[PDB]
Amino acid sequence: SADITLMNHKYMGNLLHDGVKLATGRIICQDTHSGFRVWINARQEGGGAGKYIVQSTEGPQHNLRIRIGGNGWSSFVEKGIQGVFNTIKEDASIFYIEVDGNQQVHPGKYLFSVSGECYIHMDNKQEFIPLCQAATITAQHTVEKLN
Amino acid sequence: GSADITLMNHKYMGNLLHDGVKLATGRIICQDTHSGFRVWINARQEGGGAGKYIVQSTEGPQHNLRIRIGGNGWSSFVEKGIQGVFNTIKEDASIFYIEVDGNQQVHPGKYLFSVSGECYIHMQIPLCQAATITAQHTVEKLN
């Protein structure tokens, strides 16, 4: 079961090169895992689907195209398997929200939503199944003496 | 999508435990959309067949109790790679039993049953609400 954080990165200017970091994220999992999986909660451009698109709110309403970035993160190219993956067995991983393609982005307020989990690689894929604490309970049974 | 699991112990007289006797009654709930349930015991395994288990008395491993998960509708995979028992119940709740596995003269004592479970989505996935977080970013120009 993962803990995820996302921290805005302030930036002056709107001629944004591809790769420019707009937020810094971290995912943590204490339990044993094969790696991490993170994704953006946003509509994708025309299917595609296309690049993650975020529309500004509470003011001018324009579009910004974003992706997850950072060393170690990989995306599966055959459609069907959403998000980015890494193979870090360590407990913590950094990722970024980055500008996806050179963009002159209109001034405004843009909300990034991301989700994430750790996964445990499975033979008989299956592939990578997510990793959460199962509900658990105990009961004690007494076997009585013979007498 | 976390399950809620209860386990009710049943009292019996004496230490001759016949195969199939229900030592505990379990119930597993999943209030969200799911294809079925999966349940297992956190105990060592005899590897006899499937879902079978060996529980030690609270005093230590010098005394064993052999048990299995039972109940209509529950299945286990024949290969060791996937553990526990599964069903294909889409309803909120599923009932299972911890049963005596084979006729046994059991050493008097206390035996702790630890049971875990999850609701799954058929797609070898468990239902785990992924952690989620937002941050707001302002785009602005100098002038």
Author numbering:
A (entry chain B): 0 to 146
B (entry chain A): -1 to 121, 125, 128 to 146
What did the original publication write about this model?
Enteroaggregative Escherichia coli is the primary cause of pediatric diarrhea in developing countries. Five AAFs have been identified to date and AAF/IV is amongst the most prevalent found in clinical isolates.
Here we present the X‐ray crystal structure of the AAF/IV tip protein HdaB at 2.0 Å resolution. It shares high structural homology with members of the Afa/Dr superfamily of fimbriae, which are involved in host invasion.
